[PDB]
Amino acid sequence: GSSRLEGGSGGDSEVQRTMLELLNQLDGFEATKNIKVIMATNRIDILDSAL
């Protein structure tokens, strides 16, 4: 990721389709589900803000 329209693809890049599916899944379930998604990065700033 790092953005949803980055290389002019129009949201059809695979790197962006994976991020879209991850966002849909994260919004799928409720806070009260004892399912916490821990995410890691060695470079915070590049990291996308839509997460």
Partner 1 sequence: ASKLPLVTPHTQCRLKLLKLERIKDYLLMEEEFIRNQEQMKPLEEKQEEERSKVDDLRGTPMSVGTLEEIIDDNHAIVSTSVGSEHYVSILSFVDKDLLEPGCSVLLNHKVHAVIGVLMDDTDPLVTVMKVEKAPQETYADIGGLDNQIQEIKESVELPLTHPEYYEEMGIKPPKGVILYGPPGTGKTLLAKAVANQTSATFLRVVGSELIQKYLGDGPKLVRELFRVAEEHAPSIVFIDEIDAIGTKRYDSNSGGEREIQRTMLELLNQLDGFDSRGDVKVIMATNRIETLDPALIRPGRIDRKIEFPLPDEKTKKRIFQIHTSRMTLADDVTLDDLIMAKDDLSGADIKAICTEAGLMALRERRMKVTNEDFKKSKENVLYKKQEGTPEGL
Partner 2 sequence: CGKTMLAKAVAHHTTAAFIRVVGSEFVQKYLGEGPRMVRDVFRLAKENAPAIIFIDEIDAIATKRFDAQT
Q: Does 8 bind partner 1 (CB under 8 A)?
A: yes
9 in contact with partner 2 (CB under 8 A):
yes
Q: Which one-letter DSSP state was computed for residue 16?
A: H
Question: Do 19 and 50 meet the contact criterion of CB atoms below 8 Å apart?
Answer: yes
Q: Does 28 bind partner 1 (CB under 8 A)?
A: no
Total residues binding partner 2 (CB under 8 A): 6
- Please compute, for residue 26, the number of CA atoms within 13 A of its CA located in the half-sphere on the CB side: 12
Q: Any contact of residue 10 with partner 2 (CB under 8 A)?
A: no
Binder of residue 28, out of partner 2, partner 1, none (CB less than 5 to 8 A by kind): none
**Six-digit token string for 48:** 């996308």
